[PDB]
């Protein structure tokens, strides 16, 4: 036929005109209106779109359930299946146990990732009602969360595990009843009695054929070799979406029995090419469990690769044949199949051949071997033989769901009874434009014994044979080469052990006992978590929730997918879609724009440019930005214009047909380019105190150095989004925006349009994360959209794709620092001079205020009598960098801790002793002359050092390092001081509006926006105490410019402080009005007083306002307080590094945080954990790469690696400091959002210690100050662990000299 029939949440869908390009995500959200399932990336990496599929499997003869990425699933692949979304399992009226548990355990903050995580856990439970803790963790390999730090999610779900004051109470969790899950649609069970026939779907550009038999597939390939095979679509979906590939004819062979068979033969196991990787995994796990070890070496090699291959959603549909035929150079399976000589069967109409995978199979970049009319039928994965050993290796940026830098399969076969090499095969991915074998090194080794001279001969060969051009795609050439040698060393040592286990230990020899840990397969301990906080007074009423662990008010709705984010709002029938058109050049003249092709796309409306702007094209915080480029473009990502079309698909197609011609201009990309060109934003910023000349002369030692700190992408799970609704009267417009800054959104729109501010209303219900990235940069979408709405008179909507968002909106400022520190032999610091440089990109934005804050925190926790700090902001042809949680603090403080670590090393004293003796005391003045009152940091230090048992663990670390050569541990304890308040004083103001209706219910609003930090929850808690009524009588619906005007951004961690005071004051006004009625009816309920007030004509509405008193610092006189108070905290972390690969484990972290008297210890601990884990990403794994021409390479989760479930400290302890009220802030609390992020430097410095231990083993001296830039990635860790393998790989750097990426 041509009707597409499937089920969604038990309801039958009949699509009479299915378009092959339509994904399930798009169909669910836009056709069925089910917006619980989210778009977070569109590329299989985040899991936000996770849904469950059920089907009757014809081959297994049973109902099966599995999870998929809705963003990648073509609906045309989904004939006769049943889809379940988050809405299908439960809702707020009846939550599923999974939804209840994630909500109540504080595992949902912003909530944008919650439905996908719910669906991952739900699918696991449908497959395994009693999972293990390990199975639960494994369920989320393809899910990301940017807010929670993962800990609460795993803790809540652990309650499901077979083998798994309080923040939450698991005894209150309702039990699971599997009989209450949705029925498998009866019609579908009826339909399995009728045979499957070929189906044909024809779309706008694409024809899709769902083949039922091999005969039909082969005929079609013979007659149309052009036909594109699609099985899982996990490559083709990406090729179509991101590489703009169009395959007009697609054939899906997934129904064909022959491509799905598993056959056990005498030589191995044959898998049909369409077999999902999940099936390959389950089949091989079975075989490994039942067969003797000696037969399963290759099976275990495949399994070791699949362990770190994507997550459950991808492996459910991704085929074994699809990975082979894709033939990416970084395939994880191809080097294993090549090294094992796996047997491939290829077929076409009338032909059949069997081939062995070897070098000839891959004759070029992303090519086989196969003829245009051939398909891969099956692959035989071999049993290993006696004397045959196998290892598989992968090293990436992150263990989980990542692209290999180097991947490898290695096989050795020994002549019987000997340790002489009969066969040897070493195959590599990531070392060429294809999977390659080391065919020049390995023949030289045949007949040799497995010994030290074989080791040295292979390493020397590999280093000569596996050369890389300085400009090789992927970069990291020294690291990649070092890994090939390091992987062979591990295989060499593993084979020695395997020979000993075969009772040839005397022939082969024993392993040095300090070498044994080098061969261990990756394993973690089970997680252990602690949360400590203070109970509220015994006499506090149960209805006073201030200081109580109240769950986020929207947690239940977030878990159910009922909470509404911008793009979940239904479209008006006349709504249009916008797509931005951006510069592909870093600095160029625009010489012409050609929209000829754009105009041919059906649904095209218009292309907006600078000419269409009614009033002003000048925008941005400092008016130095264009709404749309005029005459020139100044970064790759510079917005030139915007296409308007009927649908987002038509807008994307039209935007591709906008052809721009450029004339290149001289580009300034790097901080050095900018120094050389005197290209800066404003003048040097400077803080200086004491006498530097005297300080340096009195110093026993002086140490100079530099540090580079890489930037950071926010990766809020919800990208930037605006809907502009024009009202057709008086210039009136309403914008619904994911923004932290309603005021500037309103102002920038109004100024662009040329209307007063009173015409523009900006509304924000909630954001799926912001982290500073939506403080200003949101407006580049808002203004373009507001313009399209004005021009058309129709509502217009734009949500950015992840690749667009990462390119356009910028991130944290990269920093370069040059320091000189003077100190005594005692470790006492007497003089410090630091020059800071940041890379600001192509507009000023917040850059100068960021540098100010870096300079305010260059002391960190340390008293330094003679200090000079300067900052310069570089003006470059890069997307403009902006606010990011920390706002320059983390960079400033990392530099401080960096030279401090070198002070301790140079003195030969314990680092903790050096830090402690340099720490401020109560009453000291900072370098900017602010007095330190209520200085809790020494308490945080003493409590953390003791509770973490730092000294006893130091002993164990030193012991570990003496007993292990190729793994090292490190341990560090780091303090922090963080000033709370906007550096711009007048921004420290907040407003509220409160209404009491005649039923006694209260509607509260304030200037702060909800982005997952639980601000509305805290404000309700505050108002409930202030009014003395239960939280249940108070509701906050949204943030709006027309309820509270002139609001500061939700930023600087200040929002609870500012809005809390505003809310408190509005509530006090109301109470004052009710007092005469309270005095008359002293016990009569709240509702009586309110009705009495109303009928006496007393106003039940009030504004409230607050400004932080006594702020205002001058850089000129170094006087006045920039901050209202400081936040304090300490963290101790332990790590274990792999010296041979650069991988590491975060073993344990203990945090003690001063949050005053917490408004909400559940939310505050969640903020501590979330901030800490973002810092962990900043300092250890998050890295952005740019071409030498200033083009961002890193445009999605595939290449940009944020912390995953498996990244977090295995033991994770957080304590909130007891008995530390902060009188000056709302109910004695302190701000919490930004201060804990820098604490993750404890991991950076623990890594540095482990490297120092590794370097003490190979090399001359001693207390050498080696370089470690941030982030400390596997590349930087491995390269710093100088040994015999790095030495054979150094060769290169021919000045000068093209490279894949440049450091900005
Ligand atoms: C989030 C994510 C993580 C990933 N992680 C990894 C990883 O860690 N390691 C790794 O190696 N890959 C990884 N991949 C790549 C990808 O998932 C695998 O290559 C997968 O096996 C592709 O299979 P598919 O069925 O989805 O292929 P499809 O996209 O449907 O097709 C891929 C190619 O194979 C061809 N093809 C499929 N079947 C046949 C056939 N039998 N005969 C001839 N040609 C055929 C198609 O025409 C197409 O050219 C990842 C992808 C994603 C999205
Ligand atoms: N999305 C994800 O999270 C993951 C996807 N996969 C795979 O990653 C692939 C990424 O595709 P692309 O971006 O097109 O990368 P690609 O397929 O072009 O491969 C890039 C890599 O190949 C190597 N390479 C290519 N040419 C080279 C040369 N001339 N010299 C030396 N080395 C060279 C380099 O190691 C480089 O990093 C996907 O197709 C997918 O199969 C694998 C892991 C994760
Ligand atoms: O002092 C600050 N000002 C800001 O505007 C801001 N934004 C932010 O995320 N942190 C800070 N800090
Ligand atoms: S939206 Fe599908 S994986 Fe991110
Ligand atoms: S709560 Fe997980 S991304 Fe925000
Ligand atoms: Ca900037």
Swiss-Prot record:
GO biological process per UniProt: adenosine catabolic process; allantoin metabolic process; amide catabolic process; AMP catabolic process; cellular response to interleukin-1; cellular response to tumor necrosis factor; dAMP catabolic process; deoxyadenosine catabolic process
Record's GO cellular component terms: cytosol; extracellular space; peroxisome; sarcoplasmic reticulum
Details of cofactor binding: Binds 2 [2Fe-2S] clusters per subunit.
Active site per database record: 1234
PROSITE patterns reported in the protein's UniProt record: 2FE2S_FER_1 (PS00197), 2FE2S_FER_2 (PS51085), FAD_PCMH (PS51387), MOLYBDOPTERIN_EUK (PS00559)
Pfam families listed in its UniProt record: Ald_Xan_dh_C, CO_deh_flav_C, FAD_binding_5, Fer2, Fer2_2, MoCoBD_1, MoCoBD_2
Disulphide connectivity of cysteines: 508-965
EC number: 1.17.1.4, 1.17.3.2
Major enzyme class: oxidoreductase
Subcellular location per the Swiss-Prot or TrEMBL entry: Peroxisome; Cytoplasm; Secreted
Keyword vocabulary terms for this entry: 2Fe-2S, Cytoplasm, Disulfide bond, FAD, Flavoprotein, Iron, Iron-sulfur, Metal-binding, Molybdenum, NAD, Oxidoreductase, Peroxisome, Secreted
InterPro entries linked to this entry: 2Fe-2S-bd (IPR002888), 2Fe-2S-bd_dom_sf (IPR036884), 2Fe-2S_ferredoxin-like_sf (IPR036010), 2Fe-2S_ferredoxin-type (IPR001041), 2Fe2S_fd_BS (IPR006058), Ald_Oxase/Xan_DH_a/b (IPR000674), Ald_Oxase/Xan_DH_a/b_sf (IPR036856), Ald_Oxase/xanthine_DH-like (IPR016208)
Highest taxon in the source lineage: Eukaryota
Assembly with partners or alone: Homodimer. Interacts with BTN1A1.
This protein's name: Xanthine dehydrogenase/oxidase
Native source organism of the sequence: Rattus norvegicus
